[PDB]
Amino acid sequence: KKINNIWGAVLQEQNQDAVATELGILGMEGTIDRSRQSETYNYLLAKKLRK
Amino acid sequence: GLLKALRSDSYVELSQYRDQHFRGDNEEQEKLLKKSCTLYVGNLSFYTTEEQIYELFSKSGDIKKIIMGLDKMKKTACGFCFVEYYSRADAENAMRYINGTRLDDRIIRTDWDAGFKEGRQYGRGRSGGQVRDEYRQDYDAGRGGYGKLAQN
Amino acid sequence: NETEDHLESLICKVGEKSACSLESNLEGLAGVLEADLPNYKSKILRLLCTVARLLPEKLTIYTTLVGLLNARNYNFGGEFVEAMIRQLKESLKANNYNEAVYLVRFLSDLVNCHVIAAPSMVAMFENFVSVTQEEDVPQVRRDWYVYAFLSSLPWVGKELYEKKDAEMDRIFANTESYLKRRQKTHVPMLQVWTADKPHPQEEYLDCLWAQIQKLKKDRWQERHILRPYLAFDSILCEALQHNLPPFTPPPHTEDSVYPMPRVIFRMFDYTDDPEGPVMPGSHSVERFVIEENLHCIIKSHWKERKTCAAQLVSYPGKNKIPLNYHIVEVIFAELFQLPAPPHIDVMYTTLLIELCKLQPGSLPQVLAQATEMLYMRLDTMNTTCVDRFINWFSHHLSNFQFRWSWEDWSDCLSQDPESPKPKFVREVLEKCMRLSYHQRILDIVPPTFSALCPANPTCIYKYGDESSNSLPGHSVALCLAVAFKSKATNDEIFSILKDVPNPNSFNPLKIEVFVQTLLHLAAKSFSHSFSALAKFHEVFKTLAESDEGKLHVLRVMFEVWRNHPQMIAVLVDKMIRTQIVDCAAVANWIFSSELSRDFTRLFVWEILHSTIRKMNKHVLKIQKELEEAKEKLARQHKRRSDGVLEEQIERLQEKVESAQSEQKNLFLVIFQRFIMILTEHLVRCETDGTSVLTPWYKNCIERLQQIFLQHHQIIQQYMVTLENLLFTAELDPHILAVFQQFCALQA
Amino acid sequence: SEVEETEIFKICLEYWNHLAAELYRESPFSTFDVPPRRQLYLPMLFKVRLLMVSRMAKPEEVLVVENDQGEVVREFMKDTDSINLYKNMRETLVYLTHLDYVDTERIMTEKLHNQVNGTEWSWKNLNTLCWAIGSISGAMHEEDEKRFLVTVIKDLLGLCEQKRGKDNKAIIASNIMYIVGQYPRFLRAHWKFLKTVVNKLFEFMHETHDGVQDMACDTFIKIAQKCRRHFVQVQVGEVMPFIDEILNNINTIICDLQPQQVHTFYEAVGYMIGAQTDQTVQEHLIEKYMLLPNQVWDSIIQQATKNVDILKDPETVKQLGSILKTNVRACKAVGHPFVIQLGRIY
Ligand SMILES: *O[C@H]1[C@@H](O)[C@H](n2cnc3c(N)ncnc32)O[C@@H]1COP(=O)(O)OP(=O)(O)OP(=O)(O)OC[C@H]1O[C@@H](n2c[n+](C)c3c(=O)[nH]c(N)nc32)[C@H](O)[C@@H]1O
């Protein structure tokens, strides 16, 4: 009996996308809070730029 | 007696976000949040219609009102909305099971809302959208593109 | 009281995965409890009773603990047994029968830990099975007592049989005799599938009896249950046992509510996982124990999806099992459970997504196999379960980029469109489009499936084309469109409508033109339609002030938005909420000849159930307001130790009566229309010599069954009216069977 | 093999390479019945794999050399003793991985776990583990490689998040960039990951922490060379090819880079440009690509025409040297189609 891996492949792609998103917010200056989950954005860098 | 472990409800706990434009102290805002029936929904694609939000959030109960977030200047959808239920139980169910799932292939975030007021559906960023949109430096096709502060 | 919280945390911590072995942690906890016993004795007893009641999944972990304590303190063991008996009495008095079965199981296990003498347990079970000899009591009572006796056997059966063989044989003979004469009317109503192959959906007591018989044949030997107390066999052999006081089951009172009967959900067998551990058979006690423990784990952590998934994956067993298959089957058993799932439906979708995320290697493939198996067994699936399947599958696809192997279902293309498989495919595609746009759904499926894709959700206007010049009211329709575009108020709309020619206090053409124009001009979004309805509330109330007016308003609204079922649903809901129509009008419209072609579609029944839910919520809110007012009046009277308050209470009471009357009338109308249409179909089929069983008949009868199942608690109040007026003996047996099954559900 | 001596380890590694090559030649397939010799040697092949992963040599040698004129230049040694050592170790580990990839993946995962939990945490150990991870690029199938690399990158990002201090974050980020730059097939498969990596490199190019800018430029040129064809075409979800986006913001990307890093960046962009098959679009890209150097070139030429004495001004000479170095790097990266730029200044 064959194995249906369509959702497994989709989940692997989603995991890759999540890792890419995590890499996007990678930094080397300070820690960024993850309290907003998928809405997280670099607000410290934004504050630095605004000044 | 009851068991503390079985009482865990971490998914419906107050988040760290407090509306800075709320006309009241932190205690009053927390009191309103604890008994609120409204949820702020964020991280929506700019092409997410109110019908899709209705379909997704009616799985948790009967929806009273949906207020789509809009550009302050352009008056166009800017990736967030408010969903008000008739009962707190439906809002709790949405926070438990709709939070962190996919709408238009995007992980949407739900938060407790102290209550909708006129003008709260407009982004508070300088460009008229959400503050995160102007403060983000990545590229997002579903949210316009690069951040308004970067703009390529 | 930080000491009490620390003790509770210590007691609840045991059993969770830790560096130390289970035996070492259990011994240490027992020693600590003994050390602190003299002070916090009552707190410890209460905590142990609470965990026995609320954590069935860790049953053997805690009984053993008690045994260890019983080894160090005979008095503590006796007091704990007394407290447990008292708690069981309270639970039975409060109609909490699930907690009662958990406590009974705990006592049965305690027998194994040498805390309770076997003869006392045998006497208690003799009383339990003697409850089946009573007279003029409902079958649900006897069923629950037999179930409480049998479901504890997996744990204490070997001890009871090796100690008291003759008594156990007598009890088994009594149980078998009772089961042989049980009524099985409720089975067809509660069966997810009516096909005997490949897995019969068996009654829960019959399945339990078969499993217990198999266990008896295998020398009362089972190879799944975890039994930590064996590691302390030396310690527990020197412990002195206690005797349970003679237990008298509470008599059957009028205000006694018993659990409803169940049917076991079965879809998997060992051949579905040939490579992994051999799956326990359907008639094996291991399957029963695994399913019970998984259900209990879901029950304990339903609020927290991540914790629930972690507990499910880390479920410990004595021997390796195909855990993923068991978890999937348990989740789908809960989702498809009739009458209703234990928890909200979306919780199961989210939990399955979490499980797939936690075990990406294997769980998604098992889920795809289960989905294919469910699809292949849709011919006999129950319509309620088919709807739950459609909703879960569409929501799941929405979370996985709408990716599916549609080609595997190509057979659905060659079948009659009304068949369960093409109908399921169409409904799934419609629900997927509801979560996306039309073009995406058109793209994801193969071109050969294009015929099954949803139609474009575009409005239909009667006064848009040039050829409509001859249609009545065309000029008035144009004037109304101009007035709406110019922000005309209610008076202007009334003046414009006054020119509509009346064919004969109810003008069908006037309502038609007004509704068509207003809906067409607000067809941009749901919010625009709601604003339009709110702004012209006065016009709607004035025009559709009669029953015929409401029916025509609904007819015209359907005609405008025929291609957008979601719009129809939201509009009907809003109209009911703002009082444009009433639940009776919607119920009559559902069965009207205009919706005959869309009768079997999901959105019709979604609208009907939403209306019923709104009526129920209104009644509940009114009753709650009356109760609050009465409590406030009583408190004020007590504090003082009024005429306006009494008048307000009287007005609220008559409002409650009116709401109850409206709810009863709604249910009566629904049942009347169901009976009428079913009788018409049956008479036509008999006259033409056609088979009664057709897709339409299946859908209609199962929708009547769903109406009975969803609101059985409310419909119980109308038993006399339903029996005397609607569901009489003269009715055709096909229709009367549904009512008989509903009655047997709790009789 | 555990002795900390280069020559003794070289002898031992010569034997290990011979053994791995012989076993691979016997049967290159992974874990049919196991080959006889492989069956004999199975009990210790995992020990050899652990030795290879635990003592991986530095992949490249970088030397700071003063030129004839006094220019300080970073140069990569081509074929030295240490590079040969790394090549032999990489070949041995690749043979062993081809024998079975599950064991190599398990060893790497265990090393990464021990790095994360702090038991075996150190910059040297992390560098060695990342060199070992990079060395086996292409030794496993695309799907297994994708899964393993996703797991490794997730764990490394978590480690970077958990670790505190600028130095530790810089080390972990450099290791992540090195690993991703060693797996061009992974970046080619996923466009979002490639774009995120490139944007992260551009962000690092503004980082003044020592060594970060050089690492970013090296990784950028490596990715540009290996994935050149993915910067000129239009990618799904994009409006214009990434080359146009880079060229538009080239001024803001290199504002903090040093002249040598600027030359490296220009060479990488030229590698990207040279992949454009269309002649007209390629010419337009080349014209838009040399605009910033050409502005300074034209200004200097006009100043010289007005007064040749400006050519005796040292600053003008430094600017001319920088412009010509940029042109040389661009010519090397682009090739024949660079003629137009040359024709413009010849
Ligand atoms: O300095 C700003 C921002 O950078 C900073 N910030 C951002 N992220 C953090 C974290 N993680 N920790 C501490 N500080 C952080 O806070 C300042 C404001 O940013 P932000 O709160 O993101 O913007 P704001 O919410 O004020 O504006 P906008 O989103 O445009 O408001 C539009 C509309 O939406 C409501 N709303 C937004 N968000 C994110 C909400 C939320 O999380 N919960 C609720 N209930 N409502 C939210 C706004 O209040 C408006 O109603």
DSSP code for C723: I
Q: Are residues C408 and C486 in the same domain?
A: no
Q: B115: Cβ below 6 Å to ligand 1?
A: no
Partner residue opposite C303 with nearest CB, options B9, B68, B104: B9
Give φ, ψ of D120 to 5 degrees. Answer: -120, 40
CA quadruple C373, C379, C380, C385: dihedral sign: positive
In eight-state DSSP terms, residue D280 is H
**Contact of C31 with C24, CB cutoff 8 Å:** no
Dihedrals φ, ψ of B136, to 5°? -95, 145
Query: Measured between alpha carbons, how far is C716 from C701 in angstroms, rounded to an integer?
Result: 19
Q: How far is CA C27 from CA B16, C77, D229, in A?
A: 42, 16, 66
How many domains does chain C fold into? 3
What is the distance between the alpha carbons of residues C298 and C335, in angstroms, rounded to a whole number? 12
Last residue of a domain, which of C454, C474, C506? C454
Number of neighbours of residue C425 by Cβ within 10 angstroms: 24
Burial D296-307 (b: 16+ CB within 10 A, else e): ebeebeeeeeee
Please list, in sequence order, all residues whose beta carbon lies within 8 angstroms of the beta carbon of residue C274, skipping any fewer than 6 positions away: A1
Tokens describing residue C287: 């399957």
User: Which of D97, D90, D132, D91 has its CA nearest to residue D111?
Assistant: D132
Q: What is chain B's alpha carbon radius of gyration, rounded to the nearest angstrom?
A: 16
| C74 in Cβ contact with C240 (< 8 Å) | yes
Cα–Cα distance measured from residue D96 to residue D21, given in angstroms and rounded to the nearest whole number: 9
C664 inside domain: yes
The minimum CA-CA distance between A6 and chain C, rounded to whole Å, is: 7
Query: Are residues C420 and C476 both part of a single domain?
Result: no
Which two three-digit tokens encode residue C225? 């249950």
Q: Which domains does chain B have, with CATH numbers?
A: 3-123 (3.30.70.330)
- Cα separation, C28 vs C14, in Å, equals 10
How far apart are the CA of B147 and the nearest CA of chain D, in angstroms? Answer: 14
Residue closest by Cα to atom 32 of ligand 1: B123
Tell whether residue B123 is among the known ligand binding residues.
Answer: yes
Asked whether residue C270 is domain-assigned, the answer is no
* Alpha helix segments (H runs only) across C221-317: 233-237, 285-300, 305-313
User: Which strands sit side by side in the sheet containing B38-42, from one edge to the other?
Assistant: B63-70, B77-85, B38-42, B109-113
Q: Nearest CA to C308 among C363, C355, C349?
A: C355
Q: Are strands D62-66 and D72-76 parallel, antiparallel or unpaired?
A: antiparallel
Question: Which residues are registered as beta bridge partners of B77?
Answer: B70
Q: Binding site annotation covers B19? A: no
CB D235 within 8 A of CB D193: no
B9 is in an annotated binding site: no
**What is the length of chain D?**
346
Question: How far is C684 from C687, CA to CA, in rounded Å?
Answer: 5
Q: At what angle do helices C420-434 and C383-398 cross, to 10 degrees?
A: 40
The closest CB to that of A39, out of B42, B137, B149, belongs to B42
Tell me how far apart the alpha carbons of residues C632 and C329 are, in angstroms, rounded to a whole number: 49
Answer whether residue C630 is part of any domain: yes
Contact indicator for C493, C536 with CB cutoff of 8 Å = yes
**One-letter amino acid of C463:** Y
CA C396 to chain centre: 19
> Residue C236: how many CA atoms within 13 Å on its side-chain side?
22
Q: Would you state the structure tokens that stand for residue B91, as one six-digit string?
A: 């809002």
CB contact, 8 Å: A16 with chain D?
Answer: yes
D21 touches chain A (CB under 8 A): no
Strand, helix or coil for residue B109: strand
With CA atoms as reference, report the closest residue to D102 among D140, D131, D130: D140
Residue C606 near residue C569 (C-beta atoms within 8 A): yes
Q: Cβ contacts of residue C692 below 8 Å, gap of 6+? A: C681, C682, C685, C734
Domain end among C199, C233, C264: C264
Contacts of D199 in chain B (CB under 8 A): 137-139
Q: Which two tokens stand for residue C324?
A: 């993923």
- DSSP string of D69-99, one letter each residue: TS-EEEEE-SS-HHHHHHHHHHHHHHHHHHH
Cα radius of gyration rounded to whole Å, chain A? 17
Angle between helices C139-151 and C165-180 (to 10 degrees): 140
Q: What are phi and psi of B77, to 5 degrees?
A: -55, 135
What whole-number distance in Å separates Cα of residue D141 and Cα of residue D333?
Answer: 31
Beta carbons within 8 Å of D112's beta carbon, 6+ residues apart = D129, D152, D155, D156
Closest of C155, C161, C261, C150 to residue C208, by C-alpha: C150
Cβ partners under 8 Å of residue C204, min gap 6: C147, C261, C262, C263, C264
Whether residue C271 is contained in a domain is answered as no
Q: Which of D83, D134, D124 is nearest to D104 (CA)?
A: D134
Neighbours of C289 (CB within 10 A): 22
Task: Based on the fold, state whether residues C434 and C364 are members of the same structural domain.
Answer: yes
Q: Is B120 helix (H, G, I), strand (E, B) or coil?
A: coil
Give the chain B residue whose CA is nearest to the CA of C613.
B62
- Are residues C421 and C555 located together in one domain of the fold? no
Closest CA to D75 of D207, D83, D224: D83
Interface test with A, best of C355, C365, C366 (most A CBs within 10 A): C365
- Same structural domain, C253 and C228: yes
Give the angle C106-C112-C118 at the CA atoms, nearest 5°: 95
Domain boundary pick from C264, C295, C329: C264
Whether residue C460 lies inside any domain: the answer is no
Q: Taking the CB of residue C213, how many other CB atoms lie within 10 A of it?
A: 14
Expressed in percent and rounded to 5, the helix, strand and coil fractions of chain B are: 30, 20, 50
Task: Provide the token pair at D332.
Answer: 């090397």
CB of C103 closer than 8 Å to CB of C88: yes
Pocket-testing residue among B80, B83, B136, ligand 1, by greatest number of atoms within 8 A of Cβ: B80
DSSP C402-457: T---GGGGGGGGGS-TTSHHHHHHHHHHHHHHHTS-HHHHHHHS-GGGGGGSPPP-
Q: Is residue C280 part of a domain?
A: no
| End-to-end Cα distance, chain D | 58
C279 found inside a domain: no
- CA distances for C48 relative to B1, C7, C80, angstroms: 10, 11, 8
CA dist., res. D157 & res. B128, Å (int) = 33
Please give the backbone phi and psi of residue C201, each rounded to the nearest 5 degrees, phi first: -95, 95
Q: Are D52 and D132 in contact (CB under 8 A)?
A: yes
User: For residue C619, which of C742, C713, C546, C723 has the smallest C-alpha distance?
Assistant: C713
* CA nearest to D194, candidates D169, D202, A40: D202
Cα–Cα distance for residue pair A42/C347, rounded to 1 Å: 32
B112 annotated among ligand-binding-site residues = yes
List the chains bordering chain A where 3 or more Cβ pairs fall under 8 Å: B, C, D
- Token duo for residue D241: 């090819």
> Alpha helix (H) ranges present in chain D?
6-26, 36-54, 81-99, 101-117, 123-135, 142-162, 166-181, 184-189, 191-204, 212-226, 242-248, 250-253, 259-274, 279-289, 291-306, 314-334, 339-345
Helix (H) or strand (E) holding C395: helix C383-398
Q: Residue C741 corresponds to which tokens in the numbers above?
A: 């099954």
Q: Report the candidate in C144, C76, C142, C152 with the shortest Cα–Cα distance to residue C112.
A: C152
Rounded (10°) angle between helices C643-688 and C583-590: 10
Residue B54: other Cβ atoms inside 10 A: 18
Distance CA D174, CA D43 (A): 36
DSSP tag of B85: E
Using CA atoms, how far apart are residues C151 and C134, in angstroms rounded to an integer? 21
The distance from CA C272 to its chain's CA centroid, rounded to whole angstroms, is 27
| Bond into C198 cis (ω within 30) | yes
Task: List B82's β-bridge partners, or say none.
Answer: B40, B67
Q: State the DSSP H helix or E strand holding residue B102, giving kind and residue range, or none if neither.
A: strand B102-103
Residues C314 and C447 in one domain: yes
**Which neighbouring-strand residues pair with B113?**
B38
Tokens describing residue D302: 């006009």
Give the Å distances, CA to CA, from C623 to C618, C637, C654, C657: 9, 21, 11, 10
Distances (CA, A) of D64 to C10, D71, D75: 63, 10, 6
- Output the CA A39–ligand 1 centroid distance in Å: 10
Beta bridge partners of A31: none
- Asked if D250 and D303 touch (Cβ cutoff 8 Å), the reply is no
Identify the bridge partners of residue D64 per DSSP, sorted by sequence position. D74
* Ligand 1 pocket, mutate which of A43, A45, A49 (most atoms under 8 A from CB): A43
Q: Are residues C241 and C332 in the same domain?
A: no
B113 annotated as ligand-binding: yes
Distance CA C122, CA C144 (A): 18
- Smallest Cα distance from A9 to chain B, Å: 15
Contact B109 A35 (CB under 8 A): no
From CA D271, how far away is CA D281, in angstroms rounded? 15
Rounded distance, CA C126 to CA C174, Å? 9
Q: Read off the CATH number of the domain in which C472 is found.
A: 1.25.40.180
Within 8 A by CB and 6+ apart from D186, the residues are: D145, D146, D149, D180, D193
Q: Is the dihedral of CA C67, C70, C76, C82 positive or negative?
A: positive
Q: How many CB atoms lie within 10 A of CB D16?
A: 22
> Which residue has a Cα nearest atom 20 of ligand 1?
B131
Structure tokens at C375: 């699809």
Rama region for B80: left / alpha / beta (φ>0; ψ in -120 to 50; rest) = beta
C14 and C63 both lie in a single domain:
yes
3-state secondary structure of C325: helix
C-beta separation of D272 from D292 below 8 A: no
Q: Is C479 left (phi over 0), alpha (psi -120 to 50) or beta?
A: alpha
> What stretches of C73-164 show up as alpha helix (H) in DSSP?
74-93, 97-112, 118-130, 139-151, 153-163
Nearest to B152 among D237, D238, D249 (CB): D249
3-class DSSP assignment, residue D66: strand
CA-nearest residue for atom 8, ligand 1, is A43
Residue type, C180: K
Q: Rounded to whole angstroms, how far apart are CA atoms C150 and D89?
A: 66
- Same domain flag for C247 and C358: no
Quickly tell me which residue has 């326990």 as its tokens.
Answer: C280
Chain B residues touching A49 at Cβ < 8 A: 149
> Rounded to whole angstroms, how far apart are CA atoms C712 and C339?
9
In which residue are the tokens 């009191």 written? B31
Q: Rounded to whole angstroms, how far apart are CA atoms C660 and C652?
A: 12
- Domain span at residue C444? 285-454
- D164 three-state secondary structure: coil
Residue C401 has phi, psi (to 5 degrees) of 60, 25
Residue C272 maps to a domain: no
In the DSSP assignment, the letter for residue C319 is S
Chain D residues touching B138 at Cβ < 8 A: 196, 199
- For residues C474 and C450, state if they share a domain: no
**Residue C37: is it exposed, middle or buried by C-beta count within 10 angstroms (0-12/13-18/19+)?**
middle
Beta strands B77-85 and B63-70 are antiparallel
Q: How large is the C-alpha radius of gyration of chain D?
A: 24
* Among C387, C432, C380, C381, residue whose Cα is nearest residue C406: C432
- Structure-token pair, residue B124: 């508070």
Distances (CA, A) of C296 to C91, C346, C699, D125: 18, 19, 34, 46
| CA A36 – ligand 1 centroid, Å | 10
Q: Are residues C169 and C301 in the same domain?
A: no
Q: Could you check whether the bond before residue C277 is cis, i.e. omega within 30 degrees of 0?
A: no
DSSP B38-58: EEEEES--TT--HHHHHHHHT
Give the Cα separation of D144 and D151 in Å (integer).
11
CA distance C370 to B149: 49
Separation in Å, CA D184 to CA A20, A23, D127? 15, 17, 20
**How far, CA to CA in Å, does D52 sit from each of C292, D86, D107, D174?**
50, 10, 10, 22
| Residue D332 burial (10 A CB sphere; 0-12, 13-18, 19+) | middle
Q: What distance in Å separates the CA atoms of residue C35 and residue C27, rounded to the nearest whole number?
A: 12
Sequence-separated (6 or more) residues with CB below 8 Å from residue A2: none
DSSP C169-223: HHHHHHHHHHHHT---SSHHHH-SB---SSS---BHHHHHHHHHHHHHHTTT--S
Nearest to D30 by CA among D108, D95, D82, D100: D100
| Contact criterion met (CB below 8 Å) for B81 and B112 | no
Closest in B6, B62, B101 to C399, CB measured: B101
The reply to whether C385 and C472 lie within a common domain is no
Cα distances (angstroms) measured from residue D131 to each of D31, D57, D86, D180:
25, 7, 10, 11
Contacts of A28 in chain D (CB under 8 A): 166, 169-170, 173, 204, 207, 209, 212
> Inter-axis angle of helices C695-710 and C643-688, to 10 degrees?
160
d(CA C312, CA C78): 35
